[PDB]
Amino acid sequence: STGSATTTPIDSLDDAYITPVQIGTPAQTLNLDFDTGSSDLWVFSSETTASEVDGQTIYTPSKSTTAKLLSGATWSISYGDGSSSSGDVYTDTVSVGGLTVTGQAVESAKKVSSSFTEDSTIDGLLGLAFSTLNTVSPTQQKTFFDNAKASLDSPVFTADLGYHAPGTYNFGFIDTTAYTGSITYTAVSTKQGFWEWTSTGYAVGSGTFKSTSIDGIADTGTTLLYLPATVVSAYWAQVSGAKSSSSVGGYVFPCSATLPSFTFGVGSARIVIPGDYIDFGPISTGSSSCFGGIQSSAGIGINIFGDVALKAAFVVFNGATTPTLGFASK
């Protein structure tokens, strides 16, 4: 089997991407944030505290003839931005882009933190990291990909995120028309439950490539690119007037700037992030200070190749017995 679904930016800045997902019978379509940095599929639901729901589409398990309470199971998760959610669990039929999993754990939120409530466009998350990170207790549950894997034509999914445009998540096949040149594959460590890999270095603009190992995670759920402070300083030093602002919470730059590209290494290959991808617009409406798309990972504890990086590439998440990651230009 295979599946193919379009993913769409939630706003003009590509702050996140939503992908329609069918849950239950008859189908209830919710728009979920596909997140390769977590492993829970959770949704706003009929059980979510009323004051914490504001415009989201909800899953109502009582209206699904295939929903079954997973008795005794609870979940609770916190994300890298400090947001959180928790609740109980159903199993139900879940389809993505024509690919169907029966008995998928669908984690129903009873509580969500304010950032979720305040974002009307995201109805939940669909985790695509390794199932070892799944938070369901007392019986850990498998991700949608893990459940689908054996049925797929090939045990892979791909992320093809657009810059200020829709893109695609495919399951079970590699669309050879979706990228240019060849795909370069690189080793993955699953020890922390992430798609963790080691970039071979970077360049700023037309500058020389610096060969240096940068361990990090491929994380579709993260908006920005978080790298070591040394690397990030070298990038922003090439932008007149750019500075790290403690008050704003990272590097900002004059909105009048033209940003340089940023290149990262994948083995001997190179992925170029155009400068425009690194512009996240005014820090507040009408400001001439703009927020940067490359930020320091210092104090996160891990480097994160988020959407800023991934949307410059066609990315293969290879879930074979020994997982790997592939990157191609596009």
UniProtKB/Swiss-Prot annotation:
EC assignment: the record states 3.4.23.22
GO terms (molecular function) for this protein are:
aspartic-type endopeptidase activity
GO BP annotations, alphabetical order: proteolysis
What cystine pairs are annotated?
A: 255-290
Q: Which UniProt keywords apply?
A: Aspartyl protease, Disulfide bond, Hydrolase, Protease, Signal, Zymogen
Q: Where is the active site?
A: 35, 199
Q: Belongs to which family? A: Belongs to the peptidase A1 family.
Q: What is this protein called?
A: Endothiapepsin
Per the UniProt entry, what species is this protein from, by scientific name?
Answer: Cryphonectria parasitica
Native organism taxonomy: Eukaryota, Fungi, Dikarya, Ascomycota, Pezizomycotina
Q: Which residues of the full protein are shown?
A: 90 to 419 of 419
